[PDB]
Amino acid sequence: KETAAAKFERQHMDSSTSAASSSNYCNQMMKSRNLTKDRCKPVNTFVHESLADVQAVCSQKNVACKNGQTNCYQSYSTMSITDCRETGSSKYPNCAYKTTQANKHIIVACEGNPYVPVHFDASV
After folding, report:
1. Which domain covers residue 118, as residue numbers?
2. Where is it expressed, tissue-wise?
3. Is 105 a catalytic residue?
4. Which of 11, 44, 52, 89 has its CA 20 to 30 Å from the CA of residue 120?
């Protein structure tokens, strides 16, 4: 089965673009990354940076996750991210999303060896 680390890359990494270029970015990516296969995932954040810079966050600012876990880390610097949020018209299998580009610090949960991101906690 796909590992948590690989799942993180599939669900959140988009090193191939610097930012979302059109309102259709979320619709296209959510579908292409298989995030809408069984149901419309309500929200998702893509990160437009190299995997290495995102993996590096696991050795940056240690902070408590939203759920209280203490294996979360916050990026020292801001990162280019695209927030995808379901629209009022979204209906499975035709999941629809609102695309929002921003530059924020990200918070990820890390685990394993190598110690890498396995969950996107929040952007601040």
Report:
1. 1-124
2. Pancreas.
3. no
4. 89
Residue 31, domain CATH: 3.10.130.10
Among candidate residues 8, 9, 11, 12, the one labeled active-site is 12
In sequence order, the β-bridge partners of residue 98 are: 85
Q: Any known ligand binding at 44?
A: yes
To the question of whether residue 17 is assigned a binding role by annotation, the answer is no
Q: What is the resolution of this structure in A?
A: 1.7
Q: Which of 72, 119, 120, 121 is catalytic?
A: 119
* Residue 1 labeled ligand binder: no
Burial 15-33 (b: 16+ CB within 10 A, else e): eeeeebeeeebbbebbeeb
Sheet hosting strand 106-111, strand order edge to edge: 61-63, 72-74, 106-111, 116-123
Instruction: For residue 119, indicate whether it is catalytic.
Output: yes
Question: How many domains would you assign to the chain?
Answer: 1
